[PDB]
Design a binder for this molecule. Structure first.
Ligand code: N0P
Length: 151
């Protein structure tokens, strides 16, 4: 159906939840599981680092957003399109999009709003896929993501 969106949601959703809970989801990945697994391995590697390399900027943006409830979470999509979409696309910016997402996911857990995590993963996936599909396809999607960061 829309395999790119589905795979993206599973990858982004799993990373955010893992980041928030600190525990790995042992369920099998859906279609294209080998790729999604590698993708998650990759996000654990480069995503974690981004959150630390931009510690100050990340906490600065989080404060600016002042996320306290569900309505604040809903407001995030507008900011994502404003900051992420409106700019030249590259894997780094995509990793930052997803990494700050994980940063926000951990925050949501600290303020006991864990139920907003999956909805947030959906919003991020919507922004990534629905505004950058052409770039993603041209760059070989997630297979391209894994190859890009291959060590
Ligand atoms: O390359 C970037 N900026 S840059 O050019 O200045 C590169 C350096 O920046 C350092 C951190 C700067 C602060 C982080 C701002 N964000 C987080 C966003 C906005 C709110 C939001 C909410 C949620 Cl749930 C997910 C994502 C996001 C959008 O994803 C991004 C993607 C790329 C950059 C910055 C962001």
């Amino acid at each position: 159906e829309d395999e790119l969106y589905r795979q993206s949601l599973e990858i982004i959703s799993r990373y955010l939840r893992e980041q928030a809970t600190g525990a790995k989801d042992t369920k099998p990945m859906g279609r294209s599981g080998a790729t999604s697994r590698k993708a998650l391995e990759t996000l654990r590697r480069v995503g974690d680092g981004v959150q630390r390399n931009h510690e100050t900027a990340f906490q600065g943006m989080l404060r600016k957003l002042d996320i306290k409830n569900e309505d604040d979470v809903k407001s995030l999509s507008r900011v994502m399109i404003h900051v992420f979409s409106d700019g030249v696309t590259n894997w780094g910016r995509i990793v930052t999009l997803i990494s700050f997402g994980a940063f926000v996911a951990k925050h949501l857990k600290t303020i006991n709003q864990e139920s907003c995590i999956e909805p947030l993963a959906e919003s991020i996936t919507d922004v990534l896929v629905r505004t950058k599909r052409d770039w993603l396809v041209k760059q070989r999607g997630w297979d391209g993501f894994v190859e890009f960061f291959h060590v």
